[PDB]
Amino acid sequence: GDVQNAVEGAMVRVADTVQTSATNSERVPNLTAVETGHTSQAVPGDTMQTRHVINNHVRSESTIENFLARSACVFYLEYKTGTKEDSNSFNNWV
Amino acid sequence: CGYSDRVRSITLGNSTITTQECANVVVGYGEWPEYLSDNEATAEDQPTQPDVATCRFYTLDSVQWENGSPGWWWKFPDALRDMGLFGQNMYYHYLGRAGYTIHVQCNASKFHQGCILVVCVPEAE
């Protein structure tokens, strides 16, 4: 929901692989036309016989929050202890 | 009963070993080998399981025990690399998984003495 409510979460997991068998069908799931600007939705089970696998992997360090939220150094500024006659006794950063 | 616990017959594939003197059989860590589940799979491709063709007793080379001899070791699965269709499947496949029944055979008459330790060390670096 709200992204300023940090105790409210959600959960989702990476997709599983369902077992498939050999075919000799009239459907082509791996032929497509790039021109369309459409990315193919082929999954391994479409061109191999795969076993049944369960994935419990979860995308969780590729969330926008987790990616950006680490403290980066943006600038350092220098200034001496001086008097009013000095022009380095204070300093500023835009 | 008519049973004795000194006779045992292990039949696996087309290969049977009999023995008329033995003391039980040690199942490593209490667990009997079995196929990989679908909760512990990582590979997506369909496994091959050659069953009877690759499970069977491969008799490796036999060394002579002498009074002065100090001991011997073999490294598995490396040792089985020339054994029939096990070797072939291992040669053509990137990943393999299997358990093993190790059966060491020796014999002597009553007027011999001597005692050998037979131990399977996992991960011996």
Curated annotation (Swiss-Prot), chain B:
Location in the cell: Virion; Host cytoplasm
Protein name: Capsid protein VP2
Highest taxon listed in the record's lineage: Viruses
Organism: Echovirus 1 (strain Human/Egypt/Farouk/1951) (E-1)
Role noted for this protein: Forms an icosahedral capsid of pseudo T=3 symmetry with capsid proteins VP2 and VP3. The capsid is 300 Angstroms in diameter, composed of 60 copies of each capsid protein and enclosing the viral positive strand RNA genome.
Full-protein positions shown: 76 to 200 of 2184
Subunit structure: Interacts with capsid protein VP1 and capsid protein VP3 in the mature capsid.
